[PDB]
Structures are given as C-alpha cells and as structure tokens.
Design a protein around this ligand. Structure first.
Ligand code: HEM
Ligand code: HEM
Ligand SMILES: *[C@@H]1O[C@H](CO)[C@@H](O)[C@H](O[C@H]2O[C@H](CO)[C@@H](O[C@@H]3O[C@H](CO)[C@@H](O)[C@H](O)[C@@H]3O)[C@H](O)[C@H]2NC(C)=O)[C@H]1NC(C)=O
Ligand SMILES: *[C@@H]1O[C@H](CO)[C@@H](O[C@@H]2O[C@H](CO)[C@@H](O)[C@H](O)[C@H]2NC(C)=O)[C@H](O[C@@H]2O[C@@H](C)[C@@H](O)[C@@H](O)[C@@H]2O)[C@H]1NC(C)=O
Ligand SMILES: *[C@@H]1O[C@H](CO)[C@@H](O[C@@H]2O[C@H](CO)[C@@H](O)[C@H](O)[C@H]2NC(C)=O)[C@H](O[C@@H]2O[C@@H](C)[C@@H](O)[C@@H](O)[C@@H]2O)[C@H]1NC(C)=O
Ligand SMILES: CC(=O)N[C@@H]1[C@@H](O)[C@H](O)[C@@H](CO)O[C@H]1O
Ligand SMILES: *[C@@H]1O[C@H](CO)[C@@H](O)[C@H](O)[C@H]1NC(C)=O
Ligand SMILES: *[C@@H]1O[C@H](CO)[C@@H](O)[C@H](O)[C@H]1NC(C)=O
Ligand SMILES: *[C@@H]1O[C@H](CO)[C@@H](O)[C@H](O)[C@H]1NC(C)=O
Ligand SMILES: *[C@@H]1O[C@H](CO)[C@@H](O)[C@H](O)[C@H]1NC(C)=O
Ligand SMILES: OC[C@H]1O[C@H](O)[C@@H](O)[C@@H](O)[C@@H]1O
Ligand SMILES: [Ca+2]
Ligand SMILES: [Ca+2]
Ligand SMILES: [Ca+2]
Ligand SMILES: [Ca+2]
Lengths: 303, 303
C-alpha cells in the first residue's frame, strides 16, 4: 500500500522541493548523487526504508551511521536536511524522512545517469537505529557470489536484481580500506588478487598504503571506465578484470550472475529499465505505512 | 629478395638457437618480449631492418639508441647479444644481426601471445646509425591520427596496418614521460586530457610526479586490461578511454581508424592473422640483401 503521488493533496510541491535541494547540492559536489543512492540502499537493508540510517548517535547508543561500513563513508546528510527543511516550511509534519530519501536517490539517478522513474510514497519514519544491526545487515565487499545472493534473498530480492542493483557502483567512490584485501597480503601464494588487473593493482598500491584504515581519506572511483556516469560500464569493467571490489568481481564467478552481467554490459536501455525497477522494488522493503511510525520533523533525531 | 629458411643450408640451427636465447631471457623477465618487438620496429623505421639500432655510440657520433625515444626506453640488447654469441659459435660470420632481431621479435610474439608466424630471412647489417635519423623517423606518442598515418605511409604501410601494429601496445610498458602531456598541464581549460579516464588520470598523477623526465624510472603498462598477454584488449581499452598514449587514443578520433579498432577489438583471430602479416611486412622495409652490407660479427659494433 505505497502510492505514487501520496502527497498529491497534502504536499503537492514536495518532490520538486527535494529535487531542487539535490540539484543545488549536486552542482557544488557531484559526489552527493552516489552518496544518496547508497544511503537509500543502506536505509532499506536495515529495518526497512524507514529513515533509520539518518538518526544521530546519542549517549544512549551508537546508531547505524556510526557503524564501520557507514562511518566515515556515508555522505549526503546535509542534502537530506536541506530538502527536509524546505519541505517542512512548506508542509509541516507531513512528508516523512523515509520518502525524502527515496525521492532524493531518484533525483540522483536522474542527475547522474538520466535515469528517470517514479517513486511510490507514504513511508513513515522509524524510531530505532542500531549500529549492531548495521553490521549484521549490510553486506561487506568481501562477500562471494553466494553470500551476496543470500543477503538479497534475505531482503526478498532476486539474484538478478542483486546484479542489477550492483550497477550503482557505476558511479561513486571507494575508500582504500574497502578493497585493501585485494592488493596487500591476498594469499600465501601472491600479494595481489589474480582476478584484478596487475597494472591496476600496481597503481592502487601506489595510491593506497598498506597501513590504510577505514578512516584513511583516500578514495578511488568504483568505475574506472565512466567514473561519474551511472551507466552499464560497471559491467564491462567487471568482465575485464577491472572490477574494484571483491563483491564486484564476484559477479563473474558464477554462471547465472555472469550471464546477467553480459546482458547488462551488452545493453544500456535494458539495464536502465531494469535498474529503475529494482530500485523502486528496493524502496519498498519492510516499510512503515498508515499510522505506523511518525513523521520525523528533524531527520537526525526522533521526535 | 627475402626467403623463409635462408639459413636452411648455411646455419640450420639458427632460428632454434635464437628462440632458446629469447626463451631463457623471457622466463627470467617477461619484459624482454615487448622490448624486442619494439626494437624490431625501431630498427625497421630507420634505414630499414638493417640492425642499425643495435650499434653503440662512439667518440665519433651519437647513435640511434642514444636518441631520446630510444634511451633509456629500449631494452633487449643483452638478449640479442646472447643469441648472437650462440649463433656465431655455431656458424661463424653467417647469420646477420638484422635477421636475429626479426627472429627474436617473432619468438617474443609466440611467448607473449601464442602468435606464431614464419620470418623471411636474408637481411644484411648496415654500417650507419645516427641519433638524428632516429629522432626524424620514429613517431612520437604525441602524434595525432593524421601524423601517425603519414609516418607509416612514409614507410609504405597502410593506415589499417598502422592500427594493427599499434596492437603491439597490448603488452609492454611506458615511462611516465611518454604520456605526461596527458595528466599535467594538458590545456588552459583542464589539467588532464578529457579523452582519458578521470579515475585513471588521478591514479597516473599519483604514480607519476610532474617533475618527471624521460630518465625517471617509473613505468606503467600500456594495456591495463591484460598487461602481459599480447591480445586484442589494447583495442577495447582504447575505446573505453583507457588508451594510455596520446597516439593510442588517436586511433578512435578518426572514423576509418575507429572502425579498424572495433574490428580488432570485436574479433581476435582476425586481429592475430593481420598482426602476423603486418609484422612480416614491417620486417621488409628497405632491407639489404645479396652482397649489400655485411654480416656483423658483434651486433654492437661495425666490423
Ligand atoms: C551488493 C552488495 C554491496 C556491497 C557489498 C557494497 C559495498 C560498497 C562499498 C564497500 C562501497 C565503498 C565504500 C567505501 O569504502 O568508501 C560502496 C559504494 C557504493 N555503493 Fe555499494 N555495495 C553493494 C551494493 C550496492 C547497492 C545495491 C547500491 C544501490 C542500489 C549501492 C550503492 C553504492 C553507491 C552509490 C556507492 C558509492 C558511495 C559514494 O560514492 O559516496 N551499492 N558499496
Ligand atoms: C604507432 C606509432 C607508435 C608510437 C608513437 C609508439 C610509441 C611508444 C612509446 C612512447 C612507448 C613507450 C616508451 C617509454 O616511454 O617507455 C612504446 C612502447 C612500445 N611500443 Fe610503440 N609506438 C608506436 C607503434 C608501435 C609499433 C608499430 C610496434 C610494434 C610493431 C610497437 C611496439 C611497442 C612495444 C612492444 C612497446 C613496449 C616496450 C617495452 O615494454 O619494452 N609500437 N611505444
Ligand atoms: C662486442 O663489442 C662490444 C663493443 O665493442 C662490447 O661491448 C661487447 O661486450 C660484450 O661482452 C661482455 C663480456 O666481454 C658480455 O658480458 C656478459 O654479460 C652478461 C650479463 O649482462 C653475462 O651473462 C655474461 O656471462 C657476460 O659477462 C656482454 O653481454 C657483451 N655486451 C653486449 C651488449 O653484447 C663485445 N662482445 C663480445 C662477445 O666480446
Ligand atoms: C497523483 O497524481 C497523479 C497525476 O497527477 C496520478 O498519476 C496518474 O495516474 C493516472 C491513473 O491513476 C495515469 O493514467 C497517469 O499516467 C498518472 N500520471 C503519472 C505522471 O504517473 C497519481 O496516481 C497514482 O499513480 C498511478 C501510476 C497509479 O498507481 C494510481 O493508482 C496512483 O494513484 C496520483 N496519486 C494519488 C495517490 O492520487
Ligand atoms: C572474424 O574475422 C575473420 C577474419 O579473419 C572473419 O572470417 C572471414 O570472413 C570473411 C567475410 O567477410 C570471409 O570472406 C573469409 O573467408 C573469412 N576468413 C576466415 C579465416 O574465416 C570472421 O567472419 C566470420 O566467419 C566467416 C567464415 C563468415 O561466416 C562470416 O560471415 C563471419 O562473420 C570474423 N568473425 C566474426 C564473428 O565476425
Ligand atoms: C601552467 C600550469 O598550470 N602548470 C601546472 C602547475 O601549476 C601545477 O602545480 C603542476 C601540477 O603538479 O603542473 C603544471
Ligand atoms: C536491448 O534490449 C531491449 C530490451 O528492452 C530491446 O528492446 C532493444 O532493441 C535492445 N537493443 C539492442 C541493440 O539489442
Ligand atoms: C536536528 O537534530 C540534531 C540532533 O541530532 C541537532 O544537532 C540539529 O542541530 C537539529 N537541527 C535543528 C534545526 O533543530
Ligand atoms: C627451407 O625449408 C622449408 C621447409 O622444408 C621450405 O619450405 C623453405 O622454402 C626453405 N627455404 C629455403 C630458402 O630453401
Ligand atoms: C660501409 O662503410 C664502410 C666504412 O664504414 C665503407 O667503406 C663501405 O663502402 C660501406 N658499405 C656500405 C654497403 O654502406
Ligand atoms: O654486464 C654489463 C656489460 O654490459 C655491456 O654488455 C657492455 O657495456 C659491457 O662492457 C658490460 O660489462
Ligand atoms: Ca532503515
Ligand atoms: Ca559509469
Ligand atoms: Ca635500422
Ligand atoms: Ca594485452
């Protein structure tokens, strides 16, 4: 029971106002687009798309955003706040943080790849955000193909949709830490992952030191082919040994996944059409509707 | 007047002995294969395939190999000397340095790409080697499409063959200097060549400092996709903005050349078959035969 244009009557201007927020942000720093698409994904995989990822930590507990996979990597919170400030001045206590985040990811898909779709709305905001659930529910870049498939099945998403959605890594960046397993001490037999181009590896070793931590502020684009265009080049790059994350390279290590990649790589419009579906589908995981939850007036804190 | 099996009678073991020389060196350092293929190329473009590139400078004159595009980049000379020592112990004053280098490049194509072809022989060695002619006759990596086409025309090679032969950059390395134009001070409008991947550029900037010179001993593989396999991946990488040299990227800036790339990239046997013909053809530019020139007993020096 989520609908496109939930706010038709209650807040007609909302989708526009969010898109302006995002568009302003994007022109300053185009990295907010990939940032916000990841945020939406990280929302949806813990307690559903309920805005829980946006809550700050307190003295009471460490929230999701301060878990290892989220801090310091997640980015886009200013944008969300600014969209949310706009919307609250226009339709107070009406539009949820959950919908704003779903909307913003959609606006980022448009800005980064000209990918245009519509967003069912009527989500409500949760009151719970636990780092411990973030750790549990967010897949790691060290996952093999089977493990990726099982996260996503865990969220009622097909393998094929897992592959489709991985194409988000067609834009945005990675901290050194996230792929360090592949370029230092990979095995007893070699220092570097054989499934990663030895030239690329050499370059990544020179950019990213062995003592790198998750706070080391050194990043590298996930898609070496078209770093800022949300397109199907990710899938080409994965087939060419140019996949950056272990979880990226995982997609050609299993037959049905490997074929989905070939098709995504072979066909842009086809992947685009698929991506818009998967992400609309992702945006509907264990959502709160009706009277459930609240309309959080400040995204960073429970009312 | 060149024939396959020139030495059938005079030195039947020669082709084998050279292949052994090369094979031994290759197993110690696989970089000698690309090294030798470039050497053959650099021989053939100045005064013909006459062994001229192998001559040392004297107190009299600076030779080809001490010109900027050859020094310090050219490598493979010890290998050639070792094959030459072998062959002279076996068939004194019989096998030319020109043929040994043609042979060696062929042995390197086999080792690096399983590319097997036969080499017509009967070349003789020249007695002249000028740095000034090296500078004149060797194309620079800053060449646009037109300029590349005109070098090769100048040596009676078709544009299509130029494209085929560029495929040699599917293995081997480049010193930073050779592509430094692209990652520092490219224009007034931008620091980096926009036809080169922005992520790649950032990584090359990090490996290769701006103060770099042609003596700076820092190299980067020409083919980021399969750095040590002599295959058609060069051509893919060129189309994906991953072409390393300006002269590499040049090949998709002109419709005719750009279609030759698509073909090479789309079809491997096709490319392989063509490369073997082009290179045999390259090895017959302004060769000396019969009694012309000499059979140089020591490759580094005139008799
Ligand atoms: C399939 C399992 C996934 C894993 C294991 C994973 C993991 C990661 C990691 C480690 C990064 C880099 C973080 C860093 O070190 O800085 C990243 C980036 C990203 N991921 Fe994923 N990811 C996955 C799937 C997805 C999905 C489904 C989406 C969206 C639908 C997505 C969107 C993004 C985006 C947009 C970025 C770039 C972040 C930025 O540039 O700010 N990812 N991912
Ligand atoms: C088309 C015009 C060409 C230009 C401008 C050019 C230029 C270059 C440059 C600058 C390098 C790197 C040198 C350095 O800085 O270290 C290089 C490497 C190489 N080139 Fe070319 N090249 C061309 C054509 C060819 C042809 C026709 C062949 C073979 C038939 C060839 C084979 C090679 C090989 C094998 C290497 C690797 C060298 C090594 O690893 O030791 N190139 N080329
Ligand atoms: C031919 O004439 C050249 C100039 O007049 C002269 O430089 C040549 O030197 C060559 O001879 C030396 C030994 O005299 C060889 O040294 C060898 O080096 C390798 C490793 O680098 C060893 O495997 C080997 O055991 C030996 O010590 C050179 O390789 C060689 N150099 C070149 C470029 O040919 C002279 N040639 C001869 C055979 O006398
Ligand atoms: C909010 O207003 C929209 C029009 O301004 C509605 O969308 C339109 O719905 C028509 C039939 O419902 C359809 O023919 C139009 O093509 C569509 N327009 C667009 C731009 O999508 C919208 O209705 C919702 O969306 C459609 C796709 C269906 O799912 C409807 O059942 C939904 O109600 C209006 N939303 C609401 C909640 O009233
Ligand atoms: C890969 O390149 C080959 C060139 O070496 C193509 O084969 C050649 O195709 C010619 C038609 O243009 C034909 O006259 C030649 O006989 C043939 N040569 C050889 C050695 O096969 C090959 O083309 C495909 O295979 C041939 C036999 C025909 O069936 C074509 O219609 C095919 O396209 C190229 N392969 C592909 C998939 O393009
Ligand atoms: C004319 C110009 O912009 N020159 C630049 C210099 O400003 C810059 O600091 C350097 C980068 O390391 O490369 C060159
Ligand atoms: C790509 O697949 C789509 C499926 O939507 C199809 O309609 C389109 O014609 C395809 N294009 C090519 C060139 O295969
Ligand atoms: C919104 O919430 C956070 C508490 O996490 C607070 O620091 C921030 O300043 C608040 N903004 C406003 C305008 O109240
Ligand atoms: C050498 O022998 C081969 C095969 O036995 C032959 O085909 C080739 O043409 C011969 N070359 C010469 C110069 O006789
Ligand atoms: C080669 O040069 C020598 C002197 O170095 C000269 O006497 C001879 O005529 C030249 N021969 C050829 C074929 O160039
Ligand atoms: O092994 C090093 C060796 O290299 C070349 O072969 C020559 O310049 C020799 O004089 C030198 O001794
Ligand atoms: Ca959530
Ligand atoms: Ca991309
Ligand atoms: Ca020559
Ligand atoms: Ca290659």
């Amino acid at each position: 029971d989520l609908q496109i244009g939930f706010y038709n009557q209650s807040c007609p201007s909302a989708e526009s106002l969010v898109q302006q927020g995002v568009a302003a942000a994007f022109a300053n720093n185009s990295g907010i687009a990939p940032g916000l698409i990841r945020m939406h994904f990280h929302d949806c995989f813990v307690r559903g798309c309920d805005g829980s990822v946006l809550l700050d930590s307190t003295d009471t507990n460490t929230a999701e955003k301060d878990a290892a996979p989220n801090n310091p990597s997640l980015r886009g919170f200013e944008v969300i706040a600014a969209a949310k400030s706009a919307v609250e001045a226009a339709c107070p206590k009406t539009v949820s943080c959950a919908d704003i985040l779903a909307f913003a990811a959609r606006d980022s898909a448009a800005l980064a790849g000209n990918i245009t779709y519509q967003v069912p709305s009527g989500r409500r905001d949760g009151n719970v955000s636990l780092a411990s659930e973030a750790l549990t529910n967010i897949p790691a870049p060290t996952f093999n193909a089977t493990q990726l498939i099982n996260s996503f099945a865990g969220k009622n998403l097909t393998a094929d949709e897992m592959v489709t959605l991985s194409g988000a890594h067609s834009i945005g960046v990675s901290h050194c830490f996230s792929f360090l397993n592949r370029i230092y001490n990979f095995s007893n037999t070699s220092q570097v992952d054989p499934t990663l181009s030895s030239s690329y590896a050499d370059l990544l070793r020179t950019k990213c030191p062995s003592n790198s931590t998750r706070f080391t502020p050194i990043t590298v684009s996930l898609d070496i082919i078209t770093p800022t265009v949300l397109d199907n080049r990710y899938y080409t790059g994965v087939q060419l040994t140019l996949g950056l994350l272990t979880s990226d390279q995982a997609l050609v290590t299993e037959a049905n996944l490997s074929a989905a990649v070939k098709n995504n790589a072979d066909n842009l419009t086809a992947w685009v059409a698929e991506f818009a579906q998967a992400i609309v589908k992702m945006g509907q995981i264990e959502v709160l509707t009706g009277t459930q939850g609240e309309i959080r007036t400040n995204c960073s804190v429970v009312n």
